[PDB]
Design a protein around this ligand. Structure first.
Ligand SMILES: N[C@@H](CCC(=O)N[C@@H](CS)C(=O)NCC(=O)O)C(=O)O
Ligand SMILES: N[C@@H](CCC(=O)N[C@@H](CS)C(=O)NCC(=O)O)C(=O)O
Lengths: 208, 208
């Protein structure tokens, strides 16, 4: 049974939960509380599992994999159907570019451990600017790549990164009015079963 | 002729230059000076090319692609040989995980625009801690995945990310003694032609 180390409120974990649900893969969750006392991401045990001290980490087929996108691509290659990546290389480049923009160009800057180093007074502003600067660019890219979803008319890895990042944007009270395409796609994705069963509000570690 | 927008001293651009050289793809460089007066990454023109205002961006086969790894995977899928990714999915997950750790978990935190927001007095320390915390974890992963190179005995995308990040580590005067495996692999990679012809010191925008 695959084991996913996750935190119900982490955008990075939600990306993998969506992929596991779309792929119909049953998995066990081992929650890692990122906020209580330095959180468990620093306990001696989790650190030995993932030295970067972050979630998600996935145990599957007898191996341990860190990095949400590396995990999602592993799942795409090992359980092909239903596909999370298109067939055409140019459309695959749009999916990867959008995925990397969010996961490597926006989220890292508003990651908890970076916000802790920034100082309470500047946190909200720091997170907001990382997100508005990233969405300013993403919304422009989407004008070109988007159909029903981020790239064309099928759900892809880029969409698994857009939904969690938008929830983050809502948490930091970012005004999404400047981004109608992101918002439109976000709404369409949220009604899908894979984005509901994997939601932060329905995890085993979600507070009662 | 493919066009690469690059800055000779940017680690992200160096990753793509290495891939273009390994693939034997001839390309034109259009330098974007990241430091002179806010640098050209903010000029009205570059911003219209890449709204994230970062290099590299690659024009090839009639399309424009941003995000160094999305570009490298596009090149791997369109010019298969010589390969930058192994065949076995579990080894491909090690390559992607190491690549994402560096490109999404270390570099973003020491990126110029983040360092500008941090303040001169804290910059060196901020960049150093992003790198030592990332290398502390990478060196542990390598104990498991490394052969001659990051993953096994062939050069892969993870290696194209390790070399530039190590140069960054040298620039910020990070002590690499705690990481013998990273250092060992770095030395072995640097003697390879693809990592020399693509070096920061041999670009059209390198100062005379
Ligand atoms: N690039 C990594 C980032 C993972 C990471 O940043 N995880 C966050 C949750 S979104 C967390 O565990 N951070 C712990 C904290 O900052 O201490 C991925 O895509 O897996
Ligand atoms: N995740 C992007 C990051 C690219 C980016 O951060 N580029 C840096 C050079 S390493 C730069 O253009 N930064 C401009 C500055 O910070 O203003 C990639 O992998 O392409």
């Amino acid at each position: 049974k695959p084991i996913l180390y996750s935190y119900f409120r982490s955008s990075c974990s939600w990306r993998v939960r969506i992929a596991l649900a779309l792929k119909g893969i049953d998995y066990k969750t081992v929650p890692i509380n990122l906020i209580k006392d330095g959180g468990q991401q620093f306990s001696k045990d989790f650190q030995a599992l993932n030295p970067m001290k972050q979630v998600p980490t996935l145990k599957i087929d007898g191996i341990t994999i860190h990095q949400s996108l590396a995990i999602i691509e592993y799942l795409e290659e090992t359980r092909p159907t239903p596909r999370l990546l298109p067939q055409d290389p140019k459309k695959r480049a749009s999916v990867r570019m959008i995925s990397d923009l969010i996961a490597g160009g926006i989220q890292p800057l508003q990651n908890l451990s970076v916000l802790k180093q920034v100082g309470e007074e500047m946190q909200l502003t720091w997170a907001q600017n990382a997100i508005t600067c990233g969405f300013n660019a993403l919304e422009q890219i989407l004008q070109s790549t988007a159909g029903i979803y981020c790239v064309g008319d099928e759900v892809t890895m880029a969409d698994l990164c857009l939904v969690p990042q938008v929830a983050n944007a809502e948490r930091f009270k970012v005004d999404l009015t400047p981004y109608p395409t992101i918002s439109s796609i976000n709404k369409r994705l949220l009604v899908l079963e894979a984005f509901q069963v994997s939601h932060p509000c329905r995890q085993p570690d979600t507070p009662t």
